[PDB]
Amino acid sequence: MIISLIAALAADRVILPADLAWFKRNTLNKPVIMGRKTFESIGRPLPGRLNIVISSQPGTDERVTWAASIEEALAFAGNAEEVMVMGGGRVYKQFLDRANRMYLTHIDAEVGGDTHFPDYEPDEWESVFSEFHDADEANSHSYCFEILERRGENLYFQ
Ligand SMILES: CN(Cc1cnc2nc(N)nc(N)c2n1)c1ccc(C(=O)N[C@@H](CCC(=O)O)C(=O)O)cc1
User: Fold this and answer.
1) How many CB atoms lie within 10 A of CB 155?
2) 24 Cα nearest atom in ligand 1
3) CA-103 nearest atom, ligand 1
4) What element of type H or E holds 13?
5) What's 51's domain CATH number?
6) CB < 8 Å & 24+ apart, contacts of 109-113
7) Alpha carbon distance 72, 35 (integer Å)
8) Which residues, judged by CB distance below 6 Å to any ligand atom, belong to the binding site of ligand 1?
9) Strands annotated E in 36-153
10) How many structural domains is the chain composed of?
11) Which domain holds residue 75?
12) What is the whole-number distance in angstroms between the Cα of residue 35 and the centre of ligand 1?
């Protein structure tokens, strides 16, 4: 199982219909993992996806799967090839070390707020996909879709 982070980042790692569409393309038909506040932000289960919500305060919405921990979350995702972790801030940080792939939307915007996507060391990651877009009528800012994979373990010894 590949564990993947997916997130939209403004300038300075701070956390557009095209991003949402990108989000959907990349999560549809997969298990999606999220914290409770993110689930509340969406306002609903995501159709066509196995919704796993991690929380110590499991809600009454039986349409989604409620997990108490990362381990139980990954267990519900079973033998999936790829599990999508979609926020929020704390959850990204809690999954980072296990993640081997990241889908990142780099939004060209400078916005305040003190909630950041985790510090990751760029050297430890490589880009396998990248796609820039200009701002248009529907999308207020330029933005860049990117997929990063964790560089494999260095196996060489002198
Ligand atoms: C607030 N929230 C969290 C959210 C928003 N944008 C993101 N964008 C990216 N790149 N990554 C995320 N993790 C992400 N998360 C939301 C809110 C709405 C929907 C939503 O209604 N998505 C529909 C898309 C609706 C449509 O495009 O027609 C879907 O089917 O996935 C998703 C996430």
Assistant:
1) 5
2) 31
3) 10
4) none
5) 3.40.430.10
6) 109/10, 109/11, 109/140, 109/141, 110/10, 110/11, 110/12, 111/10, 111/11, 111/14, 112/14, 113/14
7) 13
8) 6-8, 19-24, 38, 41-42, 46, 86-87, 105
9) 50-54, 65-67, 82-85, 101-107, 125-133, 143-150
10) 1
11) 2-158
12) 14
Pocket test for ligand 1, best of 5, 9, 15, 23 (most atoms within 8 A of CB): 23
Read off the DSSP letter of residue 63. Answer: T
Tokens of 87: 């926020």
The structure's method of determination equals X-ray
Q: Which two tokens stand for residue 130?
A: 């990248």
Resolution in angstrom units: 2.3
Per-residue tokens: 93: 């940080």
Reading across the β-sheet that carries 31-35, which strands appear in turn? 65-67, 50-54, 31-35, 82-85, 2-9, 101-107, 143-150, 125-133
